Amino acid sequence: SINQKLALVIKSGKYTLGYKSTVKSLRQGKSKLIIIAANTPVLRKSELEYYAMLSKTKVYYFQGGNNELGTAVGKLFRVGVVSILEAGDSDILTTLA
Amino acid sequence: GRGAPLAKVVFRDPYKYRLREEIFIANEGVHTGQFIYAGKKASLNVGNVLPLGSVPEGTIVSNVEEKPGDRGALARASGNYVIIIGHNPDENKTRVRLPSGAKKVISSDARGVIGVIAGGGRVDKPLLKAGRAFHKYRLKRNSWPKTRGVAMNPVDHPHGGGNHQHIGKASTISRGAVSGQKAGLIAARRTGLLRGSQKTQ
Amino acid sequence: AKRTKKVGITGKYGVRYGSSLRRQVKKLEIQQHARYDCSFCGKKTVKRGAAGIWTCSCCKKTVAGGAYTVSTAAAATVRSTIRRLREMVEA
Amino acid sequence: PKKRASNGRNKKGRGHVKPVRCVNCSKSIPKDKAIKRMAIRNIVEAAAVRDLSEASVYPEYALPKTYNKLHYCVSCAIHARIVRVRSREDRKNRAPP
Amino acid sequence: SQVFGVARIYASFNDTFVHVTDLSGKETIARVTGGMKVKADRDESSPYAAMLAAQDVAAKCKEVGITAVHVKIRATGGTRTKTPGPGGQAALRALARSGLRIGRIEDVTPVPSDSTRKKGGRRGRRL
Amino acid sequence: MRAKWRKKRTRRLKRKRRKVRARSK
Amino acid sequence: VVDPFTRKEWFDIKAPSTFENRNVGKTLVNKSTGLKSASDALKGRVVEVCLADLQGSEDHSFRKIKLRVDEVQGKNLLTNFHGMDFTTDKLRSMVRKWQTLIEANVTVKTSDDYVLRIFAIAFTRKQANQVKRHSYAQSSHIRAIRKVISEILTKEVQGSTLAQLTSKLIPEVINKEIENATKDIFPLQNIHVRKVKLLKQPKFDVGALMALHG
RNA sequence: GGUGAAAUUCUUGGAUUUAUUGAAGACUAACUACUGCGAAAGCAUUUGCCAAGGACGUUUUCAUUAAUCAAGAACGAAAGUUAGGGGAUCGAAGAUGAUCAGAUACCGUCGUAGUCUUAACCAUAAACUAUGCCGACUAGGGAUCGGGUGGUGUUUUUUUAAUGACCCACUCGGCACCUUACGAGAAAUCAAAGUCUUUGGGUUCUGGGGGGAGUAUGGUCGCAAGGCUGAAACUUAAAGGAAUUG
Ligand SMILES: [Mg+2]
Ligand SMILES: [Mg+2]
Ligand SMILES: [Mg+2]
Ligand SMILES: [Mg+2]
Ligand SMILES: [Mg+2]
Ligand SMILES: [Mg+2]
Ligand SMILES: [Mg+2]
Ligand SMILES: [Mg+2]
Ligand SMILES: [Mg+2]
Ligand SMILES: [Mg+2]
Ligand SMILES: [Mg+2]
Ligand SMILES: [Mg+2]
Ligand SMILES: [Mg+2]
Ligand SMILES: [Mg+2]
Ligand SMILES: [Mg+2]
Ligand SMILES: [Mg+2]
Ligand SMILES: [Mg+2]
Ligand SMILES: [Mg+2]
Ligand SMILES: [Mg+2]
Ligand SMILES: [Mg+2]
Ligand SMILES: [Mg+2]
Ligand SMILES: [Mg+2]
Ligand SMILES: [Zn+2]
Ligand SMILES: [Zn+2]
């Protein structure tokens, strides 16, 4: 599944969590794909979607709240957005995404 | 003094450069910052206000107008609503069912707001003690507490007097009764513990 | 240490008003003082004040709900039966 | 003592079967114990067959029958239909005829 | 050839019904039943009465429009005996023997996907 | 008498003696 | 002393195009008096007639057809399609013990935006050497056949306007296409559609109604 | 209308019947079987989803981790209880019509609670196979269920296959049935109820003449109804089981 894919990234790849550090990555073009939680407010969503297209970065709308995304990355806290810095053994960068 | 919370909803004035604010009753689920749409052509989403003609049957709306424009008559108390049960496009009536169970038929231009009214279940909690009822009616009107007419002397009430405390005659008073007679069960078409299923046919 | 065997929050009324009334209150009273999950910001910071009104500690959103609980079963199904009807007017 | 290995009828390895209602007296009775007959009979009968094809369009046309299941509570089954009674060993005979 | 109608014989116990109607069903004609040609309240379904009911029934059929009629027999059904009553075989017989033609009869007994618990209760009508 | 009606007999009989005894607690 | 038969009218029912005969039968209404006349009062009935009386031969002896009446003009009330049922005797004789029954259905639209729900029924047959007495399926058989029949039933409908679907069902084009996709799963004797009911139709469109008349 | 037959009841309100159409709640007919699955209660429309499971397969892994179980605990038909919703149907109650010497009933009418669902309780059924679990051995037969192996088997033809369904032989594990009885039993019968005076594989539970009595009492659980634990005095020569003749 998509989570099983995100699980692969987490255990073999480079990434960051949180809104401030995903813009650090988006400005430097380091991000290959950002994942956006369902309940993330639209203003932030539209803001990332602008940064992302200026970075020419793909954007996956996670069909789930920020609580679930935190579980998805395997953390006990919640995350609103993820940034894939390097895709590890996973294929998320070139798949249905 | 009201059951249901109110919703302050501000609009632009289409004719003057100014903000004009209305006072709606909060339909359950509406929130601060929500966008409310109000009009004939308007999406069928909780919180919006639509003419009864423009919603399918089964729609559940509150604060509905009796005649179009009276700015809200039916289904206002916390927890109530009306359901549309059909349409007659020629004459553009819309048959609805009111919280009482009554099934009135009103104009399809009449306006209602999608959803039910916030604050439901308020009447499931025991007041538990006099003071709760005191502070209740304190902010409504001087209707509480209620001395029984059967505890007063006859000057005071039809039920007053007697060496024992009793009504003395049938407490069912006719519609044609006159002021000062009507006390008890006015125009009662029946009486006694309602056993068996209610729910109008 | 367990302080009371069944009254819980309802122990403030003590012996008064009759066990059954106290029982009914304890339910809704537990319903109404509790912290709820916020739809918008994903934290459990929704609390009540003024029955009907439910606002979130941070993110400062205020939702109209049921008198002693955020979502009431009625408004819940009404949500879905409106969701159903709405979809009949696009597809 | 016990007078039937089936104990009344046909349930081994099941636990609980659902009751059917008797077509004669409406007595509920489990379906496995619910003595059953198919009612195959024409719409027409002994003598009405000739008068039928006599004043009728459609040369002989089909003559189709009516079908339905019948379910009897043992009592009613014993009162009229296929029951009567058998000797000690004749009982075990499950041959229909 | 002929001008068609529908027979629709409801022949349950304790009474038998016949009545021809237009092939659309909406407009009907010439009913009379088995409790109309005898007065004993127990013979309301017996064939001797269903005959005399079919006699007067086919009369007005030719006396107004019909030269032929399809038949749709029916028992009580629903949750009831589901089997045809006594005065069904005689009624169809005593109207095909009236001169009218018979075409493509079926059975429209109501048969459910069982529900609506049968009356008489679990121990059944016991007498 | 039928077993279960005798079972019901002593059920009431117990309930009443339970009742009479509590008039004394 | 009235005898409303001295007062009733009479009307002859005409059938749609894709059959053998269009002459159906006769009816009775009333005099077309002003203020509740005979025209827009009823006219909106159905007539259940066996299509073997509508097609002649008896290879269609079962399969009732409902004809709803839409319009009228000069003692002539044309009718259109309203549904198809099965004769009770046929079904009650298809359902025999010692075999598996399989039913399936799906709701679907058409180009002419008619909505309906077609049905399907099929039974398992024995192989023509088979020893065992029952020959049941395997409940994954039954699931696959349902999904396939459902897959097949959706392609035929929305294939242009129940009118052409009327043409499709009569010669059992669907039944043998079922038999095609089925035979790779289980033998399955007796496949038919057996039933279809209409529930919604678009606006009248007096034009397209007369597109099957003349 | 309803019945053995009747009556209470419904009928200018067009009753019953018919026709088109709609609403609500319930149930899943026929297919349904000495057929399937679950620890038992139990479980039968479609489809999507969610975790679960036995049997088989196995030249995979661990290597005694197990058998059975006071206490303790999970589930537990129906009815019943609390709070919502639901309340079509059938319908403890109650009211009636009849029958009867009577008829608080059986039959007929009306119909409250109930029946359905959510949240909580209750923990009982002839909850039955009236028959503990794990292991071994002891006997013949043909059916069927699931898995698997064998095929110069049949049928589907396309061009021969591949498949799918079917046939035949085998082998595990199912639900059962048939015949025997070496054997067992008081018998009815029983491949276990057999391999017991030639009396010992492991282990759990209960019973000790009939009433009294599942009563009294205490404890404990339960909102209630009631559940679990549970005596004695006294009384009594029988009660009981299976079979045989009447
Ligand atoms: Mg005052
Ligand atoms: Mg007072
Ligand atoms: Mg007062
Ligand atoms: Mg005084
Ligand atoms: Mg006075
Ligand atoms: Mg007075
Ligand atoms: Mg007085
Ligand atoms: Mg008083
Ligand atoms: Mg006996
Ligand atoms: Mg049984
Ligand atoms: Mg059982
Ligand atoms: Mg009897
Ligand atoms: Mg006292
Ligand atoms: Mg079914
Ligand atoms: Mg009810
Ligand atoms: Mg009574
Ligand atoms: Mg009496
Ligand atoms: Mg009584
Ligand atoms: Mg017990
Ligand atoms: Mg049993
Ligand atoms: Mg053997
Ligand atoms: Mg022997
Ligand atoms: Zn928040
Ligand atoms: Zn019976």
Q: Are A42 and A14 in contact (CB under 8 A)?
A: no
Those of residues 20-79 in G touching chain D at CB distance below 8 A are: 58, 61
Name which of B97, B80, B84 is nearest B54 in CA terms: B84
List the helix and strand counts (H, then E) for chain G.
Answer: 6, 8
DSSP structure string for A62-77: -SS-HHHHHHHTT-SS
Residue B146 in tokens: 């209620």
Q: Are G84 and G65 in contact (CB under 8 A)?
A: yes
Q: Which residues of E37-52 are buried (b: 16+ CB within 10 A; e: fewer)?
A: bbeeeebbbbbebbbb
Angstrom distance (rounded) from CA C44 to CA C38:
6
CB contact under 8 A, D27 and E97: no
Which phi and psi (to 5°) does residue D75 adopt?
-50, -60
Burial of G165 (0-12, 13-18, 19+ CB in 10 A): buried
CA of C16 to the centre of ligand 3 (A): 23
The minimal CB distance from D21 to the residues E89, E100, E118 is found for E118
Which phi and psi (to 5°) does residue B96 adopt?
-125, 165
Q: Which residue has the tokens 């209740």?
A: B136
Q: Find the DSSP H helices in chain C.
A: 19-32, 73-87
Q: Find the DSSP H helices in A13-94.
A: 19-27, 42-54, 66-72
User: Of all helices (H) and strands (E), which one includes residue C48?
Assistant: strand C46-48
> How much is the CA Rg of chain E, to the nearest whole Å?
16
**C-alpha count within 13 angstroms, C-beta hemisphere, residue D86:** 12
Resolution attained, angstroms: 3.1
The shortest C-alpha distance from A64 to chain C (Å) reads 11
Angle G56-G62-G65 from CA coordinates, rounded to 5°:
80
Angstrom distance (rounded) from CA A12 to CA A9:
5
CB contact under 8 A, E101 and D45: no
Q: Is residue G194 part of a domain?
A: yes
Distance D2 CA to H187 C1' (A): 13
CB contact under 8 A, C13 and B122: no
The interaxial angle of helices E89-96 and E47-64, nearest 10 deg, is: 40
The shortest C-alpha distance from E70 to chain G (Å) reads 10
- Strand segments, DSSP code E, in chain E are 10-12, 15-17, 20-21, 28-29, 68-69, 72-73, 101-102, 106-107
CB contact under 8 A, A66 and C42: yes
Which residues of chain E are within 8 Å of residue D26 when distances are taken between CB atoms? 118-121, 124-125
Domain count for chain G, please give it.
Answer: 1
Pairing of strands B185-186, B172-173: parallel
Q: Which nucleotide is nearest to E113 (CA to C1')?
A: H29
Angle E49-E51-E55 from CA coordinates, rounded to 5°:
120
Pairing of strands B111-114, B49-51: antiparallel
Name which of G99, G116, G207 is nearest G161 in CA terms: G116
Angle B55-B61-B64 from CA coordinates, rounded to 5°:
100
Residues 6+ apart with CB under 8 A from E63: E30
Burial of B157 (0-12, 13-18, 19+ CB in 10 A): middle
Residues 6+ apart with CB under 8 A from G9: G28, G29, G30, G31, G32, G38
Looking at the CA of D70, name the nearest ligand.
24
How far is the CA of B2 from the CAs of B133, B142, B177, E12, in angstroms? 14, 15, 33, 62
Angstrom distance (rounded) from CA C77 to CA C37:
19
The shortest C-alpha distance from E86 to chain D (Å) reads 12
Question: Contacts for A23-30 with beta carbons within 8 Å, 24 or more apart?
Answer: A23/A48, A23/A51, A25/A83, A25/A85, A26/A51, A26/A52, A26/A54, A26/A55, A26/A57, A26/A83, A27/A51, A27/A55, A29/A55, A29/A56, A29/A57, A30/A83, A30/A85
Residues 6+ apart with CB under 8 A from G162: G81, G110, G112, G114, G116, G198
Angle B80-B85-B88 from CA coordinates, rounded to 5°:
135
How far is the CA of G175 from the CAs of G84, G150, G166, G170, G195, in angstroms? 15, 12, 14, 10, 13
Residue F9 in tokens: 């007999």
Question: What range does the domain containing G40 cover?
Answer: 6-214
Method: X-ray
Please indicate whether chains B and C are in contact, defined as at least 3 beta carbon pairs under 8 Å.
Answer: yes
- CA E91 remoteness from chain centre: 7
CB contact under 8 A, C79 and B125: no
Q: Are C72 and B29 in contact (CB under 8 A)?
A: no
Residue A91 in tokens: 């294929």
CB contact under 8 A, C40 and A39: yes
SS3 E92: helix
Q: Is residue G78 part of a domain?
A: yes
Task: Give nucleotides in strand H with any atom < 7 A to a protein C-beta.
Answer: 1-7, 16-22, 25-38, 40-48, 83-84, 86-92, 106-108, 111-113, 129-131, 143-147, 153-156, 163-168, 175-179, 187-190, 213-217, 225-226, 241-243
How far is the CA of B157 from the CAs of B154, B181, G40, in angstroms? 5, 9, 63
Distance D24 CA to H44 C1' (A): 25
Chain E interface with D: residues with Cβ < 8 Å: 1-2, 68, 73, 79, 81-84, 89, 92-93, 96-97, 99-107, 111, 117-126
Q: Is residue G1 part of a domain?
A: no
Angstrom distance (rounded) from CA C78 to CA D27:
43
Which phi and psi (to 5°) does residue E58 adopt?
-75, -20
Give me the sign of the Cα torsion angle G90, G94, G95, G97: positive
CA of B172 to the centre of ligand 1 (A): 27
Burial of B120 (0-12, 13-18, 19+ CB in 10 A): buried
What 8-state DSSP symbol labels residue D30?
E
User: Of all helices (H) and strands (E), which one includes residue G164?
Assistant: helix G161-169
Q: Quick count: other Cβ atoms within 10 Å of Cβ E10?
A: 22
CA of B72 to the centre of ligand 6 (A): 40
Name which of A32, A41, A47, A46 is nearest A82 in CA terms: A32
Q: Are B128 and C21 in contact (CB under 8 A)?
A: yes
Q: Which residues of G115-125 are buried (b: 16+ CB within 10 A; e: fewer)?
A: ebbbbbbbbbe
- Tell me how long chain C is: 91
Q: Are B166 and B184 in contact (CB under 8 A)?
A: no
CA of E105 to the centre of ligand 8 (A): 73
Amino acid at B56: P
Which phi and psi (to 5°) does residue A77 adopt?
-85, 175
Name which of C88, C68, C77, A42 is nearest B46 in CA terms: C77
CA of D6 to the centre of ligand 21 (A): 20
- What are the residue boundaries of the structural domains of chain E, listed by start? 1-127
Which residues of chain E are within 8 Å of residue D22 when distances are taken between CB atoms? 124
CB contact under 8 A, E96 and D58: no
